[PDB]
Amino acid sequence: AATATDRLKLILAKERTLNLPYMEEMRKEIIAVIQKYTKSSDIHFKTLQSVETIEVEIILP
Amino acid sequence: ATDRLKLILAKERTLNLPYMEEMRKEIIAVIQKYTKSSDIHFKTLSVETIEVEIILPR
């Protein structure tokens, strides 16, 4: 319903064309930081215009 | 013209998160650690969203 379970959402957008070989490493660390301050353990992260959005859904404790 | 990056951290504005703004700080740090970007813009806008637009330097 419109009440139980607190979520947090993180989006990382970039040029689909762009290189950046560390995106992964960055993803991992970014998530690591969130878990640190939110103590969350339920984390969902998927990838997909021509913009690419690493989407990350985080359920708070 | 310029290669940008953008990040959104969204939450329900009601919800009380003492640590927001710390996460923001830290998270930016990580991004800088990896992008080395000297240019960063963050603003806060039912749903509170923290947006960080980042300009890559390389």
**Cβ-count burial of B30 within 10 angstroms (0-12 exposed, 13-18 middle, 19+ buried)?**
middle
DSSP letters, B9-47, are EEE-SSS--TTTTTHHHHHHHHHHHHH---EEEEEE---
Q: Which pair of structure tokens corresponds to residue A59?
A: 């359920």
To test the contact with chain A by mutation, choose from B4, B9, B51 the residue with the greatest count of A C-beta atoms within 10 A, namely B9
Domains of chain B listed by start with CATH number: 1-58 (3.30.1070.10)
Determine the distance from the C-alpha atom of residue B20 to the mean position of all C-alpha atoms in its chain, rounded to a whole number: 11
Give CA angle at B13 (B12, B15), nearest 5°: 75
The SS3 assignment for B52 reads strand
Do the Cβ atoms of A33 and B26 come within 8 Å? yes
Do the Cβ atoms of A9 and B6 come within 8 Å? no
Q: Nearest CA of chain A to the CA of B28: how many Å?
A: 9
Task: Please answer whether residues A51 and A15 qualify as being in contact, where contact means their C-beta atoms are separated by less than 8 angstroms.
Answer: yes
Neighbours of A56 (CB within 10 A): 19
Question: A15-46: b or e for each residue (b if 16 or more CB lie within 10 Å)?
Answer: eeeeebeebeebbebbbebbeebbebeeeeee
Task: Please answer whether residues A14 and B52 qualify as being in contact, where contact means their C-beta atoms are separated by less than 8 angstroms.
Answer: no
Nearest CA in chain A to B57: A20
